[PDB]
Amino acid sequence: ASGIYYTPKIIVDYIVKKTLKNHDIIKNPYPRILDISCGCGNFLLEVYDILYDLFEENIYELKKKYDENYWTVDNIHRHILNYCIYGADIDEKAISILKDSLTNKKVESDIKINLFCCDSLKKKWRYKFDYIVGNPPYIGHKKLEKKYKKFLLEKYSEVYKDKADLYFCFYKKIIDILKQGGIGSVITPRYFLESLSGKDLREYIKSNVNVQEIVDFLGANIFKNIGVSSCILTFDKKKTKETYIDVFKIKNEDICINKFETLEELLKSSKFEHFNINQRLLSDEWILVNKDDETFYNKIQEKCKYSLEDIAISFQGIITGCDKAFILSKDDVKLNLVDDKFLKCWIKSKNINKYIVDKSEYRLIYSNDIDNENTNKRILDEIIGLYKTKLENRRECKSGIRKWYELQWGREKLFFERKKIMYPYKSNENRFAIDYDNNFSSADVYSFFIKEEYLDKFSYEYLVGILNSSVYDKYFKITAKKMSKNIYDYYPNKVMKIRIFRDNNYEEIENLSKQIISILLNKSIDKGKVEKLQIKMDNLIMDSLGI
DNA sequence: ATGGGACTTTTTGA
DNA sequence: TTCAAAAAGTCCCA
Ligand SMILES: CSC[C@H]1O[C@@H](n2cnc3c(N)ncnc32)[C@H](O)[C@@H]1O
Numbered sequence: 001a002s003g004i005y006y007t008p009k010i011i012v013d014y015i016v017k018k019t020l021k022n023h024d025i026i027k028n029p030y031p032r033i034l035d036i037s038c039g040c041g042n043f044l045l046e047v048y049d050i051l052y053d054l055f056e057e058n059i060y061e062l063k064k065k066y067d068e069n070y071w072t073v074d075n076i077h078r079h080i081l082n083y084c085i086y087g088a089d090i091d092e093k094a095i096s097i098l099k100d101s102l103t104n105k106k107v108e109s110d111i112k113i114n115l116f117c118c119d120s121l122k123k124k125w126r127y128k129f130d131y132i133v134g135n136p137p138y139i140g141h142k143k144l145e146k147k148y149k150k151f152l153l154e155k156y157s158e159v160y161k162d163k164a165d166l167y168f169c170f171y172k173k174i175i176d177i178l179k180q181g182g183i184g185s186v187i188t189p190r191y192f193l194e195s196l197s198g199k200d201l202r203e204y205i206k207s208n209v210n211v212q213e214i215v216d217f218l219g220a221n222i223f224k225n226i227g228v229s230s231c232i233l234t235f236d237k238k239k240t241k242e243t244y245i246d247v248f249k250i251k252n253e254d255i256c257i258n259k260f261e262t263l264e265e266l267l268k269s270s271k272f273e274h275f276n277i278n279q280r281l282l283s284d285e286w287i288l289v290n291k292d293d294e295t296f297y298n299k300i301q302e303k304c305k306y307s308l309e310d311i312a313i314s315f316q317g318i319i320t321g322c323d324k325a326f327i328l329s330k331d332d333v334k335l336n337l338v339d340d341k342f343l344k345c346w347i348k349s350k351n352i353n354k355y356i357v358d359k360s361e362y363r364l365i366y367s368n369d370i371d372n373e374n375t376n377k378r379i380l381d382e383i384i385g386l387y388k389t390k391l392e393n394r395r396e397c398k399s400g401i402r403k404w405y406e407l408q409w410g411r412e413k414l415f416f417e418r419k420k421i422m423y424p425y426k427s428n429e430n431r432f433a434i435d436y437d438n439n440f441s442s443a444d445v446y447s448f449f450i451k452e453e454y455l456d457k458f459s460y461e462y463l464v465g466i467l468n469s470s471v472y473d474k475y476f477k478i479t480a481k482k483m484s485k486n487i488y489d490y491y492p493n494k495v496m497k498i499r500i501f502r503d504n505n506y507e508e509i510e511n512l513s514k515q516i517i518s519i520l521l522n523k524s525i526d527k528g529k530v531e532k533l534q535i536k537m538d539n540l541i542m543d544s545l546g547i
Numbered sequence: 548a549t550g551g552g553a554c555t556t557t558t559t560g561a
Numbered sequence: 562t563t564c565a566a567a568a569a570g571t572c573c574c575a
């Protein structure tokens with residue numbers, strides 16, 4: 001619970017260099033560089049060294065242009081601390097350590113150091129800043145205290161709503177206190193580039209700064225032993241004529257970040273691709289792909305006349321609120337106590353394959369159908385009641401909306417007890433399966449069924465055929481939310497926006513999917529024929545979409 | 548024992 | 562009344 005994260009030195013040197021690379025110290029020898037989340041001083045200590053080289057290399061020009069008694073090498077250290085370096089952190093010990101480090105850069109009157117121990121989101125900042133760098137805290141909607149969220153919802157509502165992250169507000173604060181003509185460069189999670197929550201934040205950035213560069217590391221592990229995916233955003237408040245973004249997108253998530261001495265060498269190498277995006281062409285969604293992918297994506301969008309949302313009804317799985325209380329192995333002897341009318345088949349995300357679901361190994365006790373506590377007393381006493389204390393702490397039980405033994409979000413049984421399509425909520429590839437067995441699931445598996453009015457235009461067999469194809473795997477990943485290494489989010493807020501088509505190839509595509517399903521359900525599966533049938537289907541789909 | 552792969556709960560705002 | 566989003570994921574192993 002330290003809360004302090006060490007940014008890799010190669011990232012720190014890149015961010016500091018990207019802001020101070022072309023600063024004109026002769027024109028402005030009083031630049032104000034700020035880190036509002038400085039921690040122990042990863043960025044500010046490097047800012048000191050860059051500034052010290054800058055002043056020393058131009059000391060005689062400064063001496064000649066301005067006060068010749070003020071601009072001496074022996075005075076550079078005092079000048080940097082008084083007028084240039086600013087830091088803020090909520091952690092007293094980190095500020096105390098950083099104060100010692102800045103003091104020890106040179107070893108008389110004491111020197112005032114512009115280090116504030118405060119909440120950067122509450123501090124009344126008395127002026128704006130030329131340069132802002134650093135690494136803000138990332139805290140999501142579960143790990144943030146509710147009283148603090150009430151404050152964020154009221155004062156940061158332009159970027160913070162619903163399931164937004166704390167670092168959204170640091171983007172707003174950094175932008176707000178950045179001088180005209182200033183430059184900001186930060187490392188944050190990448191998820192705001194695509195997530196539904198980040199929509200308002202994306203609008204705020206696009207409308208208030210010129211985005212110079214986005215370095216997207218995708219699923220690469222920048223922070224050791226940390227489950228987060230990172231990007232570097234550099235932006236400015238300069239009067240720009242044309243506003244194009246440099247986008248550096250990693251191509252191999254397996255790289256060791258220290259392959260070169262500098263991050264610039266990595267960005268220019270074959271490990272990264274570069275392309276430009278017109279900031280004026282950004283909609284609420286930022287589609288940051290190269291020209292080949294953009295042509296591909298636009299081709300499918302224009303050709304497809306329906307979306308899944310148009311033809312399907314989507315829903316999230318059961319949320320029991322305590323899985324250990326209600327989920328049992330199908331061979332558990334405790335299920336002899338439960339009448340089979342209470343038992344539902346239960347699958348996990350790993351049970352979903354392309355076109356078909358694995359046989360379920362677990363059973364859900366649909367405890368909502370338990371009428372009285374005196375009837376079915378043994379089910380409550382010997383199975384569900386083993387977790388009564390944990391069950392009573394669920395929000396709806398504390399308020400009395402749910403009895404302690406009920407499912408927290410049991411949804412509607414009828415939605416699950418029908419032919420439907422299921423997909424994992426997080427996966428490396430498109431895996432849409434037809435469920436024939438009335439499978440229930442938690443929120444790690446999503447489902448949809450086709451609306452009645454569209455059943456004559458679209459069959460489940462046709463839909464899983466195109467959705468599992470290599471075309472639609474690539475098509476979905478163009479705009480999908482990249483979570484971690486080899487994991488995209490497959491959530492309705494993007495899955496339901498997938499567009500679909502029907503044309504002369506419908507019958508052959510549907511027939512190939514039926515053949516694959518028939519093979520996959522056999523005892524002695526020969527998977528080889530399935531792969532050949534998939535290749536032929538991919539050719540039909542590419543012909544249909546003209547790609 | 549650190550790095551990498553398999554796999555994914557329930558809290559929460561709206 | 563009841564929906565769906567959210568990785569500073571989580572856990573294990575050689
Ligand atoms: C550089 S890693 C994130 C840093 O942000 C700091 N931090 C967390 N919350 C805040 C806040 N509200 N204001 C300023 N710094 C913060 C933490 O103490 C940590 O050192």
Ligand SMILES: [K+]
Nearest residue numbers: 063064066068
């Ligand atoms: K002079």
Ligand SMILES: [K+]
Nearest residue numbers: 219220221228
């Ligand atoms: K990662």
